[PDB]
Amino acid sequence: GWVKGVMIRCMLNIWGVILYLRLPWITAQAGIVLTWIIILLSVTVTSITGLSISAISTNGKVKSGGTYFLISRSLGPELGGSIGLIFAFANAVGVAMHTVGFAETVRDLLQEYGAPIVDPINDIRIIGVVSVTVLLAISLAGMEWESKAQVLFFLVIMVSFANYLVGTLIPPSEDKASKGFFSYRADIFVQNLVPDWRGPDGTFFGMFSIFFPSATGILAGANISGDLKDPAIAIPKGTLMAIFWTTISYLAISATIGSCVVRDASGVLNDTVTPGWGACEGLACSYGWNFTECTQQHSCHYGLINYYQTMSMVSGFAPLITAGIFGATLSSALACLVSAAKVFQCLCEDQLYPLIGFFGKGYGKNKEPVRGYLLAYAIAVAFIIIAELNTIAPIISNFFLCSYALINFSCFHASITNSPGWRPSFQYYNKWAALFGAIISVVIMFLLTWWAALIAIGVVLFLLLYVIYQAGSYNLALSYSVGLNEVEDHIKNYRPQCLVLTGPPNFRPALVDFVGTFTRNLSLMICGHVLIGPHKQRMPELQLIANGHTKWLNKRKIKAFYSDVIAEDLRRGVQILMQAAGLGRMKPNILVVGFKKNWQSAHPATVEDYIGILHDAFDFNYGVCVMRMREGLNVSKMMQVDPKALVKEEQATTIFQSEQGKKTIDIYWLFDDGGLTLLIPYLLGRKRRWSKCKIRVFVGGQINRMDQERKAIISLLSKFRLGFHEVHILPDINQNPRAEHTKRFEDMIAPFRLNDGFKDEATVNEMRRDCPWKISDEEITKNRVKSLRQVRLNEIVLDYSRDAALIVITLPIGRKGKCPSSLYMAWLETLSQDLRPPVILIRGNQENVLTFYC
Amino acid sequence: GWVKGVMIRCMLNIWGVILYLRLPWITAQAGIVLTWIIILLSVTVTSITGLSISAISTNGKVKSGGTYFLISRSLGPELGGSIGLIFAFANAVGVAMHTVGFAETVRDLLQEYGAPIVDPINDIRIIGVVSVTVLLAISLAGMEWESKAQVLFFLVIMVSFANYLVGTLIPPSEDKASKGFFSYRADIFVQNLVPDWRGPDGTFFGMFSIFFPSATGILAGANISGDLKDPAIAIPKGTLMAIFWTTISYLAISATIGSCVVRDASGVLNDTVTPGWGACEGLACSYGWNFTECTQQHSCHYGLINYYQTMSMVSGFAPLITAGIFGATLSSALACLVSAAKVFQCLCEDQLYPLIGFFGKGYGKNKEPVRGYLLAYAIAVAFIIIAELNTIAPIISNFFLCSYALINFSCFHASITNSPGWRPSFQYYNKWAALFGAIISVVIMFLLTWWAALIAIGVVLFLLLYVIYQAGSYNLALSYSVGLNEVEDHIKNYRPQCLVLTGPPNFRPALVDFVGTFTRNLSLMICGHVLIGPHKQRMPELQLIANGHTKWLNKRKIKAFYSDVIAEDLRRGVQILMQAAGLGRMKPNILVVGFKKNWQSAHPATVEDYIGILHDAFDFNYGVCVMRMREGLNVSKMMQVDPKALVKEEQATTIFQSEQGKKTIDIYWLFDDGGLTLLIPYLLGRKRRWSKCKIRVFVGGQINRMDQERKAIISLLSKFRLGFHEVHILPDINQNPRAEHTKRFEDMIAPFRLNDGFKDEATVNEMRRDCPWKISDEEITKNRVKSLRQVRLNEIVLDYSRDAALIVITLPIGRKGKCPSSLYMAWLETLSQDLRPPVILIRGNQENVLTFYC
């Protein structure tokens, strides 16, 4: 339920050692008014944190429970992981504080009854170590008696409170009056209403740092959210009621102990007032006691400000309050230890931090964090070695204030940024109240001591930034794609979607880098390897080889999407890839095909396949490009870096980027239909390294007009962001070429004079003028026109461009049925046959433009 | 250039009041060693910040930009705005500091002539406010000549340094020796090597806070940008050289003033030691000077630790050092004043903060920040009212340390997160050096004083958090989906990428719906429509058809991509789309096929093509699935105005489409592997529609042991939440053969014997064995028992699951070369016979299981 399950659990964890041992002393040094102010200032922070905790408990629905699990699932991995670690450390030090208080009580019992062990501080150390070892032994094995222990502890604390209140009303005896107790008196109340400020810790915030661990423990209700009936209505009321009732108890005890005991008293029973004309100085003189001797010399042993166990002295039966101290300290220490271990284990099971993951495994059948229990025990022992409560308490105040500020600010952050899963139903949660609580918690943390607060904030920032440096990554790409399913065919975004042939990626990598240069974070570039084996498709050995190849490619920091194809020949192999690659609107639009360095050496029939590539690409309304670099195409000389992944020379391509380019692109327009002609040069022409480029826009501009035909391209020039009027009119585009060049063009096809790959087509010629080698207006009979033109282009490139870093060569057009594949190949070969420049071939598909950069 | 452009004006801003007024006093209170440590510790912070600033300057080619512009464009707006605000405030307070130093110098000058105004402190206030008003008047109008005033200031400071050194070289005069300066002496150097803390400000960090303004002024090099020939080379050299040379000057002045002036001296010229025995003490006694009275009485007026103007006294010509102080102060204060105003104006140009202060508005033709100038003047006057360098300097140290820590951490943040616009070219920039600089800056800021450091940090946090609080996806894909291309392969999450073959999307819409409600933002679903085109694409209008189908899909709630493949048949027709659909990881993983229910009407070729897709899916590691309906998946759409969404009638046939599933789904998963067999109804179950259907597990096979295998299944069920433990036994497959069910099958496979139309099979078979059911290790003989099992599965569909949402039977498996096509197709027809509700068959590729949803 909510009473015993939640409120009593929070009660037993909030009530602890400072309630019995230091609250009367805080009331003595700070007075009743400032002690109440301290109590209320701590309760403000803890109640604002409790409202955030209640909002967390009402957010969504969590069935397993746990403080770290609730906070992290409601607030996030970064803030949740910082909270689950600072809170775990704070709970580990709380064990040390409560065990030190229990050890101090046992030491006082030994001093009054019997003999001490070694030394009043060393006895505290020894008893604390032994008691924390016993607590660890109980936690590891023997955690089934917890309901009975909870009932016994709550009843013993109730009995201690009742006995203290009963003995306070009793009129003082000789011993109690000697020790400073005079029942209730207005004079003592008025005297103790004001501070005294003795010792090094006499300070308002010095007292706040010692009292504050009396207000912590409000997170015990959230620890068992899974093991409750209805957490959304049980955790808030239980936590808030526990905070309220413990606040009432602290205020009442402070008020009644301030009004009963004087600050200074001496245990000597002879200090009763002598019947004569004495010089009695203190307030106790009116009550018949003479405490001047020690009060003037600051050597009193008893009193509110000098005796730490005055609460037990005041009461009717000291052993009952001793049992109450034992119960409170043991319950709080056990709760802190088990909470630290369980939060740390759950935090470690979520791999958010590198090295803590070792303390994440459980033992036995219920998976107890034995490693976490041992780490918490080690931290507790280390802080127990400090045998002073007034030293441990400020540390716990700092770390619990840091944890509460973190929780409050995490709730405020989740509220202000409208976090997805952050939907609190708690009626009394306000994000500005949480922000105020976090701010005041940090301010108080720095006010108690600045260096420990700085260390805590530094650790918090380290963890938060480490984590920063059910979201999912696959579903996001899917969501963006389907959102694009509603993309507008309107303003067709003719991004340079391209399809690339490389075969194995380690071979022909010049294309890879090339189409990798541009469309970097601009569009899609798809690599394409076609396996040419028609028999035994390596279904098993396809993903693995791709993996390896993609890793190599990825090691090159490329931006592509390799693709594997099985087929019998090149033609149908790429035909499969072009019309089915991508998905929906996410489809490739441009094809680039690697040239075969050795085509005329042997294997004649491959000309058909290679030219069918281009013809089917033309018919498919794709973009088309050829690939032939300075050096040989296929890498077959290795047996004497090699993996571009390791090292990628790619000089032929890297020249443009690695080296600062001083020579420019040269294009032309003999085929005006090609719109891409102003895009592929645009794309590549606009890259970081490609920055250095004095764009030479060579175009067949109108021989008389440079302002409406050439500027027709200049008005459009703006969108292509060209900014160049370099329209170099070279009307010598197709002038009669060199005699020698035509000669070579011919005997090039002399071996292939026949349509060897076209017997069928020869029969067609046979029935049509029987043209064996010369073809009317198709080969050289009349088609020579285009051949002499293209060769003139070659002369041009070789004369004007001469040494040309790169050339935008427009692939010429041949329509099937009026020109053979042979001549087409012949044209491809003669595009750059004389030498070996880098073939930056290009041609478009009469598609619209001005997509990139307007 | 770089010298005069950067380093000369960085020195002029770094040199200021503390160089002449408090450095000797710091060397007096702290030791020479401790003063050197302070200087080097400040220079470490400023040099790390200078490295960060040099990295910022060499980032990109930002032109015509101040300090704030550079920082906010290289770094983020969130960090840039806070940096600009803190830097502007720090400069505004530095104006007050340098004006107070100038006023102190003028007040001392007035006192030495015996003409004070009102009193020491109020005279400082009056002179400082008048000076700062004159400074504001110069800054507003009359700055045109500040370009030539720079040379005068630099030459004046150089002359002051030379005069100080020359005067230090001079042997003592009677007046100078009386005032404490004798000369370079080893004894004085040794005496001043050790610290001597002699006031409220006497502490290591107390002197660090006063000195540190001597090291600030390096960002003065940053705001020059736009007036430099080459910032990427000028800014780093100038800034670092200025830091080095000013550090050298500070160290030299400290070590030379600590070696010639004693800490205690009296301006009385009669202290000269009187001859006789005496009891004279002190180091000066050895030089004939008995300063005993003041030293013991602590009433000395002169000396290093008492006189604030010791550089002036030591130097040969006092007015020259006064001129040097004037030049240094009026250069640093003017630089700070015209830096704070410009940074604030640029910051207010960016609508980054709500209360702009409107100081952003420029005046005149140069758009000078008159409003910003007045705000800076007001802040300077407010901090001038303090009129004490030892109090103003700690504030400026705090705020400049905050600014430098902010810059260093912002550079580190940009480096570690790999910001898109952060690619610094500075060779000596390291993000860990920047992190160290920011951390030590914050530590020193809190060490000097904690409350002002907390105020500055809170202001920075407030600003930062306030600022913190169409082929787009195409492009977004580049960063996410090609970021999805790089993802590990060891994730092995069996993404249920699904492929479908409904032909036209409108037709066979039931499969579309089924594959759409499932994978609704979970898995990729791709719609493949085959146009079986045997010629040139009919028209681009086909693309219109594509947009019409995508609109149809969007007219409902589908997340489909539409693609098409041109072919001449179906087997190859799907085969094209099969191994090329998708791209990289996103690629479809399983395949569903529109069942050609009509199979006894058309030639069996269609049936052979049909078995083709399933066999190919078996060879390509794909998943096979198939639906079936009573009225017709390939419903004739018989026809037996604004027609509304046919969804209503459609969903009648497609419950999943809209109707929340009510009746139970049953997985007749005779086959175990191919997890999708269960996954399909599973992520179908996740669906709210199917949340109303107990997921029935109809396992079948062995009867002797049931749960023995199940315990493996319930382990993977703990992983794949089921919520049930009752798997109904299907012993029908065995010992339960029903004759009338065999007779139908036989009468259902007649024209299907050797109807594969496989002439080669017939031939090879004919030369092996004759009869169409003789050579039957494959022909419905060895696998006949399988046909019995199939018809029994249908019978237990009619009994065990008489009614169900979808009867999920495991899709059968047939071996190529060991299972004929007609036998398999008849098996499927039995498994999905008539008079059944929607029915689905599945069989995965047994890659791995449990990968999804644990």
CA distance B307 to B176: 12
Rounded to the nearest 5°, which phi and psi values hold at A10?
A: -70, -35
Among chain B residues, CA nearest to A490:
B470
3-state secondary structure A766-782: HCCCCCCCCCCCCCCCC
Residues recorded for chain A: 854
Closest partner residue to B583 among A561, A575, A579, by Cβ? A561
The single-letter DSSP state of residue B694 is: -
Token digits of residue B508:
């066979």
Testing the interface with A: which of B413, B525, B550, B563 to mutate, by most A Cβ within 10 A? B563
Longest dimension (CA), chain B: 148
Task: Judge residue B143's burial from the number of C-beta atoms within 10 Å of its C-beta, 0-12 exposed, 13-18 middle, 19 or more buried.
Answer: middle
Q: What would the DSSP string read from start to end of B707-718?
A: HHHHHHHHHHHH
Breaks in chain B (C–N > 2.5 Å) following residue = 469, 640
Q: What would the DSSP string read from start to end of B461-509?
A: HHHHHHHH---HHHHHHHHHTSTTTSS-STT------EEEE-SSSSSSH
CA distance B418 to B306: 53
Instruction: Name the nearest CA neighbour of A15 among A215, A306, A179.
Output: A215
3-state secondary structure at position B655: helix
Token digits of residue A230:
């209805």
In this complex, how many residue pairs, one in chain A and one in chain B, have their CB atoms less than 8 Å apart?
Answer: 165
Please tell me whether B570 is known to bind a ligand: no
CA distance B165 to B320: 12
CA distance A9 to A3: 9
3-state secondary structure at position A529: strand
CA distance A391 to B22: 40
> Residue type at A276?
G
Cα separation values, A306 from A21, A25, A26, A105, A266, Å: 12, 8, 11, 16, 10
Q: How far is CA A165 from the centre of its chain?
A: 54
CA distance B183 to B192: 13
Closest partner residue to A477 among B480, B486, B493, by Cβ? B480
Instruction: For residue A418, list chain B residues with Cβ-Cβ distance below 8 A.
Output: none
Residues in contact with A16: Cβ distance below 8 Å, sequence separation at least 6, in sequence order? A94, A97, A98, A101, A213, A214, A217, A328, A329, A331, A332, A333
Q: What would the DSSP string read from start to end of B376-436?
A: HHHHHHHHHTT--HHHHHHHHHHHHHHHHHHHHHHHHHHHHTT-TT-----TT--HHHHHH
CA distance B583 to B403: 48
Q: Using what technique was this structure determined?
A: cryo-EM
CA distance B528 to B512: 11
Cα separation values, B105 from A48, A568, B100, B263, B318, Å: 54, 94, 9, 21, 12
Closest partner residue to A583 among B554, B563, B575, by Cβ? B563
The single residue listed with the structure tokens 């099969």 is B578
Instruction: Name the nearest CA neighbour of A565 among A501, A643, A613, A633.
Output: A501
CA distance A660 to A625: 25
CA distance B788 to B772: 20
Token digits of residue A836:
């070996």
Partners of B261 in beta bridges: B181
CB contact under 8 A, A481 and B481: yes
Token digits of residue B657:
């489409």
Over the range B95-105, which residues count as b (16 or more CB within 10 Å of their CB) and which as e? bbbbbbbbbbb
CB B384 within 8 A of CB B100: yes
3-state secondary structure at position B835: coil
CB A195 within 8 A of CB A31: yes
Say how many CA atoms lie within 13 Å of A101 toward its Cβ.
34
Instruction: For residue B481, list chain A residues with Cβ-Cβ distance below 8 A.
Output: 477, 480-481
CB contact under 8 A, B485 and A550: yes
Residue A199, by phi and psi: left (phi above 0), alpha (psi -120 to 50) or beta? left
H or E element, residue B833? none
CA dihedral B425, B429, B430, B436 (to 10 degrees): -150
B553 touches chain A (CB under 8 A): yes
CB contact under 8 A, B540 and A621: yes
- Helix B370-384 with B77-112: angle, nearest 10 deg: 50
∠A474-A476-A479 over CA atoms, to 5°? 115
CA distance A529 to B579: 12
CB A184 within 8 A of CB A190: no
Token digits of residue B378:
């007001």
Q: How far is CA B537 from the centre of its chain?
A: 47
The single residue listed with the structure tokens 């020939």 is B229
Partners of B562 in beta bridges: B527
H or E element, residue A566? strand A564-566
CA distance A243 to A43: 7
Residues in contact with A493: Cβ distance below 8 Å, sequence separation at least 6, in sequence order? A851, B470, B471, B474
Sheet containing B839-843: order of strands: B561-565, B525-530, B498-501, B590-593, B623-628, B839-843, B807-810, B666-668, B696-697
B498-501/B590-593 β-pairing:
parallel
> Residue type at A641?
V
Over the range B195-211, which residues count as b (16 or more CB within 10 Å of their CB) and which as e? beeeeebeebbbbbbbb
A620 touches chain B (CB under 8 A): yes
Cα separation values, B830 from A253, B825, B827, Å: 85, 9, 5
Please tell me whether B60 is known to bind a ligand: no
Chain B: nearest CA to A480, how far in angstroms?
A: 5
Closest partner residue to A476 among B480, B562, B578, by Cβ? B480
Sheet containing A590-594: order of strands: A564-566, A525-531, A498-501, A590-594, A623-628, A839-840
CB contact under 8 A, B583 and A619: no
Among chain B residues, CA nearest to A616:
B536
CB B386 within 8 A of CB B30: no
CB contact under 8 A, A565 and B579: yes
B454 touches chain A (CB under 8 A): yes
Cα separation values, A669 from A664, A676, A747, A828, B737, Å: 17, 11, 29, 17, 77
How many C-beta atoms surround the C-beta of residue B21 within 10 A? 25
Partners of B591 in beta bridges: B499, B624
Residues in contact with A500: Cβ distance below 8 Å, sequence separation at least 6, in sequence order? A511, A512, A515, A525, A526, A527, A528, A560, A592
Report how many helices (DSSP H) and strands (DSSP E) chain B contains, helices first.
Answer: 31, 9
Say how many CA atoms lie within 13 Å of A587 toward its Cβ.
26
CB contact under 8 A, A547 and B489: yes
CB contact under 8 A, A473 and B495: no
CB contact under 8 A, A480 and B477: yes
Among chain B residues, CA nearest to A555:
B486
Instruction: Name the nearest CA neighbour of A616 among A659, A569, A579, A662.
Output: A579
CA distance A256 to B539: 96
> Residue type at B470?
Q
Partners of B839 in beta bridges: B628, B807
3-state secondary structure A652-677: HHHHHHHCCCCCCCCCCCCCCCCHHH
CB B503 within 8 A of CB B530: yes
The single residue listed with the structure tokens 């199917």 is B690
Instruction: Name the nearest CA neighbour of B130 among B381, B416, B437, B474.
Output: B381
Among chain B residues, CA nearest to A476:
B480
Residue B583, by phi and psi: left (phi above 0), alpha (psi -120 to 50) or beta? beta
The single residue listed with the structure tokens 């008079």 is B835
∠A729-A733-A735 over CA atoms, to 5°? 125
Closest partner residue to A475 among B483, B521, B619, by Cβ? B521
A580 touches chain B (CB under 8 A): yes
**What are all long-range contacts of B537-542, with beta carbons under 8 Å and residues at least 24 apart?**
B537/A619, B537/A620, B537/A621, B537/B566, B540/A621
3-state secondary structure at position A466: helix
CA distance A322 to A328: 10
How many C-beta atoms surround the C-beta of residue A273 within 10 A? 16
H or E element, residue B653? helix B647-653
Residues recorded for chain B: 854
CB contact under 8 A, A481 and B473: yes
B417 touches chain A (CB under 8 A): yes
- Radius of gyration of the CA atoms of chain B, in A: 45
Task: Judge residue B639's burial from the number of C-beta atoms within 10 Å of its C-beta, 0-12 exposed, 13-18 middle, 19 or more buried.
Answer: exposed
Chain A: nearest CA to B411, how far in angstroms?
A: 14
The single-letter DSSP state of residue A501 is: E
Restricting to B residues 466-495, those with a Cβ less than 8 Å away from any Cβ of A are 469-487, 489, 493, 495
Instruction: Name the nearest CA neighbour of B302 among B256, B276, B266, B338.
Output: B266
CA distance B673 to B846: 6
Report how many helices (DSSP H) and strands (DSSP E) chain A contains, helices first.
Answer: 30, 6
Chain A: nearest CA to B284, how far in angstroms?
A: 42
CA distance B403 to B728: 72
B623-628/B839-843 β-pairing:
antiparallel
Rounded to the nearest 5°, which phi and psi values hold at B740?
A: -60, -25
3-state secondary structure at position B668: strand
Restricting to B residues 16-35, those with a Cβ less than 8 Å away from any Cβ of A are none
CB B49 within 8 A of CB B407: yes
Residues in contact with B255: Cβ distance below 8 Å, sequence separation at least 6, in sequence order? B27, B32, B36
Instruction: For residue A473, list chain B residues with Cβ-Cβ distance below 8 A.
Output: 480, 483-484, 487
Q: What would the DSSP string read from start to end of A157-205?
A: HHHHHHHHHHHHHSPP-HHHHHHTB-SS-HHHHHHHTS----STT-SHH
Token digits of residue A720:
């292509």
Instruction: For residue B621, list chain A residues with Cβ-Cβ distance below 8 A.
Output: 539, 543
3-state helix, strand and coil shares in percent for chain A, rounded to the nearest 5: 55, 5, 40
A764 touches chain B (CB under 8 A): no
Token digits of residue A238:
């239980």
Resolution in A: 3.8
> Residue type at B408?
N
CB contact under 8 A, A580 and B561: no
CA distance B290 to B295: 10
Partners of A500 in beta bridges: A527, A592
The single-letter DSSP state of residue A225 is: S
H or E element, residue B335? helix B318-349
CA distance B353 to B360: 12
Testing the interface with A: which of B485, B495, B551 to mutate, by most A Cβ within 10 A? B485
A456 touches chain B (CB under 8 A): no
Among chain B residues, CA nearest to A419:
B469
How many C-beta atoms surround the C-beta of residue B337 within 10 A? 27
Partners of B626 in beta bridges: B593, B841
CA distance B328 to A167: 76
Cα separation values, A56 from A70, A352, A411, A707, B648, Å: 7, 21, 8, 70, 42
3-state secondary structure at position B623: strand
Residues in contact with B705: Cβ distance below 8 Å, sequence separation at least 6, in sequence order? none
- Helix A318-349 with A120-140: angle, nearest 10 deg: 50
